[PDB]
Amino acid sequence: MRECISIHVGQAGVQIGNACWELYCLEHGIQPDGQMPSDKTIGGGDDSFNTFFSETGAGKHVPRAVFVDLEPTVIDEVRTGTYRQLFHPEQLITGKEDAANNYARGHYTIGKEIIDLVLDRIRKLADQCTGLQGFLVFHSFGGGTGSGFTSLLMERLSVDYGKKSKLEFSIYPAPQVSTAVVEPYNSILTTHTTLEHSDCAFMVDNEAIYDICRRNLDIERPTYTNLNRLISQIVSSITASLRFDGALNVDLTEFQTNLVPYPRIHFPLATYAPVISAEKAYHEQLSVAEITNACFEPANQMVKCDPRHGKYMACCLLYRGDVVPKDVNAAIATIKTKRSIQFVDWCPTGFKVGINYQPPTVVPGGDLAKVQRAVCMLSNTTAIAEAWARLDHKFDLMYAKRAFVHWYVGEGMEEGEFSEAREDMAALEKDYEEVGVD
Amino acid sequence: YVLIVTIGNKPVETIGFDSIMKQQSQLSKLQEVSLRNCAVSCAGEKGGVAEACPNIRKVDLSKNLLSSWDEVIHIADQLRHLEVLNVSENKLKFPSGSVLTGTLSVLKVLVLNQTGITWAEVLRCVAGCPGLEELYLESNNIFISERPTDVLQTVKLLDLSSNQLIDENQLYLIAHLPRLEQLILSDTGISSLHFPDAGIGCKTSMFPSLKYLVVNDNQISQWSFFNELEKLPSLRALSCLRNPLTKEDKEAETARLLIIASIGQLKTLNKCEILPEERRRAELDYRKAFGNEWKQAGGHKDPEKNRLSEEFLTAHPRYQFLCLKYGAPEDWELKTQQPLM
Amino acid sequence: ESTIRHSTQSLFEYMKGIQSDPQALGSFSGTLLQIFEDNLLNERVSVPLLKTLDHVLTHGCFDIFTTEEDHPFAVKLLALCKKEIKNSKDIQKLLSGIAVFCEMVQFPGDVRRQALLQLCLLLCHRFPLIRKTTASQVYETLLTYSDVVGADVLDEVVTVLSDTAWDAELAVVREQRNRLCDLLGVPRPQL
Amino acid sequence: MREIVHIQAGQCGNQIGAKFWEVISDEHGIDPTGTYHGDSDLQLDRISVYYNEATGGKYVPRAILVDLEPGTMDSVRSGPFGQIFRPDNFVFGQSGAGNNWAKGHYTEGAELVDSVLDVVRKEAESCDCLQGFQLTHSLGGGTGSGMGTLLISKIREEYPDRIMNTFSVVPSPKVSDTVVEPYNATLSVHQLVENTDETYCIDNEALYDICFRTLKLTTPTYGDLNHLVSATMSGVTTCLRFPGQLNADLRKLAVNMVPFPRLHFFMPGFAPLTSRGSQQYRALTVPELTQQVFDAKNMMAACDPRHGRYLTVAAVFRGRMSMKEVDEQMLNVQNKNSSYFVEWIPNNVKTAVCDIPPRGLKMAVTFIGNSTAIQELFKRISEQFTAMFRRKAFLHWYTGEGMDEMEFTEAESNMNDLVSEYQQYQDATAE
Ligand SMILES: Nc1nc2c(ncn2[C@@H]2O[C@H](COP(=O)(O)OP(=O)(O)OP(=O)(O)O)[C@@H](O)[C@H]2O)c(=O)[nH]1
Ligand SMILES: Nc1nc2c(ncn2[C@@H]2O[C@H](COP(=O)(O)OP(=O)(O)OP(=O)(O)O)[C@@H](O)[C@H]2O)c(=O)[nH]1
Ligand SMILES: [Mg+2]
Ligand SMILES: [Mg+2]
User: Fold this and answer.
1) Which of its termini does chain D have fewer beta carbons within 10 Å around, N or C?
2) Ligand 1 pocket check for A187: Cβ under 6 Å
3) Where is the protein found, in the record's own terms (chain C)?
4) Is D260 on the interface with A (CB under 8 A)?
């Protein structure tokens, strides 16, 4: 077996990791204090949950996570939370100054006096693992800290841990849920600084998840808490491939070979179904075909795009719960007869399907109901490039008058970094269209 | 459980299918069975199901050919570890109280949606399962003519949606329940609910432990329902979406803050936590809205000059509470906008 | 502000010397109209020119052209202004137009009546601020020039422009507009 | 816990700082002895931003007062609240700079600049995490004009990662008849542009005209202007001392309100306008306050906000008004079809709502915008700076201390370039 370490960064990152760990504990049955009455061993090596959690002699389960934040406002609440005895104090690192929505800070001003300590803490967890696969980064492009500090840590690790995979779960900023006016600069800087430090990266449109929570879940004003509970489901469905004894994308290296054909292109679209509310629990029973067909709905997609107007390079379907291959064959045939999608003839990868005998789970009194089946579709299509087009519009307009640019150059940054980052974005956009040439 | 294609220009790579096929073949380890649209009429020879699948936690007998309730009771007897059950979309014929007890001694969930069951049969069918928590009864046209006595005691959840034959008279019968934490009433046609057994400020013994309440898709057009809801001893949560008052318009938000003002123990509304600032803003808006009405029906800052009619006390019983929380509205706060020439 | 304050004072000092000579004033007005015609539908020179015309008319520079009915200069000026105020949406450009239309009522003849009609078209605009500004400018012009409306009807026009909320719904403002038109002799507009 | 170090220099600077501290102490509920006696828990959740928690539950201010002349020092030491300021935070000499900028920045004010750095460094060592320094002085004089610039230039070299905010008080011929004021103002602005991220301009002519017309006071003294200055200062620093949804720190506020490096001068204001003595007379509402925040009469500078573009807009409300009531009012004034719509109240404005109201008033409002009209404050000093430079009047005093015409022409060119950039940006496309 092989272990894994999740490195969370920023406010959004730390808020998403707590919910993910809570969902994992509710699924595997881990108690708040860290006691698995079903486990019949004291140490890890023969079970299956040892990839994410770590066992000790006293039966305590210490989640393999490295939470690092600059503002202690959120870490103080995360420490005194319900799972105070779960996470180790050494894993939680806090700073003394906030970036205040700035990348040149989270990277050079506030990222220099914290990086020398983050590595010493990550080494303590890396030495305990006999075979580490890679890293599971959780941050957001909007937040200045979550972007700058994450990019600094990523490249810092590229030197030491070079022969290790790298993953990401960023959150694409939206105009409605915007905390900074410099969101476009930080995003275009972090996408260019770590375009080579990420083997695979997942983007979460704040608009798509908000619309999903407002329509599907039927919520008036979905708060960050509700948006984090919904993303936890997708995170668990994605990590089930490595947590359980499955047979599809069991290792982080398999993600770069079955989803990321081109090293440069590493932004695969993801979708998860169904999305039933708690009130309408036993209202309707959707079979595998319905949930598989709902994946092709722009409203249900995690990012606002139009895959219909684009080719497909790699596609991976993952079923969870009561699902039989006989029923999955019906959906596979319907995808071809009813629906129709083209494919890139120059792409090596193709279509893959997998099933896992693990039913879903929801938090007591939550927003989502305990459905009987779940489906997760990961498709790498060029349509996602549209999401990168609008992002370049705002940045370009702002840098046309060079507003809020002096605040970055005067914090350990050069004026040429912006030109380099948008020259890289232009090249990526051009390659996105060149890959989908008839 | 005991038993190529190309999309566009590429093949489908089904991997791990053999593992799932081998795991599902073991009938002696199926912790969850689902037979939707599988034609299940009878249970078969007794003793076989108890030996082939002696461990079952959840069953989904929805959309089957179950004609009689005895066929379901037979399967429920062999399944000792039956926790969750669902027999929706079945025109079963229940007996006149002949179902013996002990068949469902560990049934925590029971869904009976779309079954044509009546209130007289629900009590007879929930006779052999006192530890029943969830009990769904949606789309049944049930008429609450009787009331529980020795059954339906630990019913933590009671769903009665898609039933346009429920009113306050029928709710009073199922109001003396001891453990009633949830009572869904979506699309029930209800429009008014009062508590004559309690006065202004005093609580009511009906629905004491009613924590979460749902009343979506109803004719809720009066603020008399929200005003009556305050009498409930406990009511931390409420959903009132898609209604004549809380419509999808832009000004509908103005009604939201009103609800938070009509209830004091409302910590969440429509799955949205009400932070202290939100409650303060709602209370301030509610106090500023009826500022003119509070003075029209008598009222002054000095306790000496004060006389509120019964109308203002029954329509706004919580106004006096805010009067002491944020003082009384002065003469300058009652002029937020006026025309000019 | 300071630049405009200085330029206006410097221009008035020069205009005071060419105020009696009709040839100089005529040449200046012709050059101004030519500049206006050249930079038409231009938001770089049209707004400044319209703003300067307001001050030029308020100071009383074109006082010799007021002793003649149907002056070609004031006719072409009003024609160009109507062109520049055609569908005007922005409120910055509408303010200067309203000011010019109210500072042009001084010229008697067909320019006095027609110009007044324009004011009516601005009393029932699409925004209440425009209506209020037009009403205020009309009230100010009625007090400035007294020979524009007779004394017998001036009282009614003054009373109608005072106790009337010009920032209300158009359903009630149209009645006041029609009443003011019936008193000022302006023909009833037509949608 | 973000702390801020407040520094005061010059007679006018110290007089303004003392009044501002007294105001923010009376508003927070702190008796002149040192203990706390307020009646609200919100007056302590952010008291550490400007008060150190010493032994015995006392709150020690953080005001570092410096003055070459031993005048205002003794007055502040024996003031209504003189017993609050630490006693070794007072740094003074005997003879000042004699209304010469080359004296309080090179020969005299650079003689106590070393004791100032030791004091400001001893005060910051106790803080857990410093955010940014602060200074309150007047462009007129030598100890306010030269000492402030010297300290700003000396602190930026040792703390480049700290925000630098000032409260320059531009003089006016009406308040003072000194003739060596234009040079001191020009040389101060020359240094306040290349080593300052934010500068709140409080022109004296504006306050003089306000006291002459609005307040209708007989002979407006320095106290009337100091009261308004302290009121504006307390109204500006409302988010940095009280909770709220808009948790805009100093760096975040400077980044969101100052898009350009050189352009950073604001036009602070405050409403309603009051005076000393009585105050309770009329209770204002939210509409009236919004209509008055954006009037050039409520501004503390001789500039017309309407005449000029709008770089960044911001407003802070104080009283029982709700951010929901404020948003309703801020979304109908940026619309033409809306009634009582204003053309000078711009769009994308920042807005705040406070609970604790000011002293002697139940509802108030503060405006912190940056309009191009501020250029008028820079041109008025330019003319007076040129007419006196061609004749080389009072230039021997500057050339004898060490200065030269090079610095004068450099400051003149910098001011001209700033005015040109302001005029160019004033004519910009809205969309
Ligand atoms: N999905 C999601 N987005 C979040 C969350 N918290 C913040 N965001 C978004 O992320 C961006 C701001 O990032 P933050 O995490 O607040 O920034 P940070 O990493 O703390 O760094 P600073 O700039 O110093 O505050 C905005 O687009 C927010 O809307 C969260 O919990 N979930
Ligand atoms: N508003 C206001 N302006 C003041 C005050 N005191 C002085 N001024 C103005 O500031 C200028 C004088 O500067 P001061 O602060 O007195 O001088 P200084 O900084 O101590 O410098 P030296 O004269 O060199 O000792 C003149 O323009 C005064 O009108 C005051 O209390 N309030
Ligand atoms: Mg943060
Ligand atoms: Mg002095």
Assistant:
1) C
2) no
3) Cell junction, Tight junction; Lateral cell membrane; Cytoplasm; Cell junction, Adherens junction
4) yes
Query: Which of these is catalytic: A196, A254, A290, A429?
Result: A254
Closest CA to A81 of A22, A169, A155: A22
Lookup result for tokens 């809801």: B229
Q: Please, is C16 exposed, middle or buried when counting C-beta atoms within 10 Å of its C-beta (0-12, 13-18, 19+)?
A: exposed
Distance CA B3, CA B12 (A): 20
- Using alpha carbons, select from D426, D311, D290 the residue that is nearest to residue D367: D290
Distance of CA A266 to the CA centre of its chain: 12
* Residue A366 Cβ < 6 Å to ligand 1: no
- Domain extents for chain D? 1-259, 260-373, 374-430
CATH code for residues A1-268: 3.40.50.1440
User: D374-430 is classed in which CATH architecture?
Assistant: Orthogonal Bundle (1.10)
User: Quick check: D17 and D135 in contact, CB under 8 A?
Assistant: no
D335 carries a ligand binding annotation: no
Cα D91 from chain centre: 22
CA nearest A268: which of A188, A385, A162?
A: A385
Task: Measure the CA–CA gap between B260 and B268, rounded to whole angstroms.
Answer: 9
Token pair 């209304």 in the structure block, residue:
D99
The amino acid that residue A306 corresponds to is D
**Residue D302 forms beta bridges with which residues?**
none
Q: Strand, helix or coil at B215?
A: coil
Residue A225: CB atoms within 10 A of its CB come to: 12
Residue A185: which of A226, A227, A147 has the closest Cα? A147
Question: Which of B138, B100, B135, B142 shows the shortest CA–CA distance to B117?
Answer: B142
- Indicate the domain borders of chain A: 1-268, 269-383, 384-438
Determine the CATH number of domain D260-373: 3.30.1330.20
Cβ atoms of A266 and A201 within 8 Å: the answer is yes
Q: Tell me the three state secondary structure of residue B133.
A: coil
Q: Does domain D1-259 have CATH number 3.40.50.1440?
A: yes
Q: Do chains A and C touch (3 or more CB pairs under 8 A)?
A: no
Q: What's the rounded Cα separation, in Å, for the pair A131 and B321?
A: 64
How many Cβ atoms sit within 10 Å of the Cβ of residue A149? Answer: 29
Inter-residue contact A106 to A98 (CB < 8 Å): no
Q: Among B236, B187, B185, which residue's Cα sits nearest to residue B210?
A: B236
D1 lies within 8 A of chain A by CB: no
CB A207 less than 6 A from any atom of ligand 1? no
Superfamily of domain A269-383: Tubulin/FtsZ, C-terminal domain (3.30.1330.20)
Q: What's the Cα-to-Cα distance from A262 to each of A423, B75, B173, D381, rounded to whole Å? A: 19, 55, 67, 63
Q: How far apart are CA B62 and CA B338, in angstroms?
A: 62
Q: Long-range contacts made by residues B205-208, C-beta under 8 angstroms, separation at least 24?
A: B205/B176, B205/B233, B206/B172, B206/B175, B206/B176, B207/B175, B207/B177, B207/B180, B207/B183, B207/B232, B208/B232, B208/B233, B208/B234
Type of residue at D252: K
CB B25, CB A356: distance < 8 Å: no
CATH topology of domain A384-438: Helix Hairpins (1.10.287)
Against chain A, the chains showing at least 3 CB pairs within 8 Å are: B, D
Give yes or no: A254 in active site: yes
For residue A179, give the ligand 1 atom closest to its CA.
26
Nearest to B277 by CA among B253, B260, B293, B262: B260
Going through D26-93 in order, the beta strands assigned E by DSSP cover 51-53, 59-61, 63-67, 90-92
- State which amino acid sits at residue D126: S
Experimental technique for the deposited model? cryo-EM
| Rounded Cα distance, A210 and C77, in Å | 56
Whether residue A358 contacts residue A321, with contact meaning beta carbons closer than 8 Å, is answered with yes
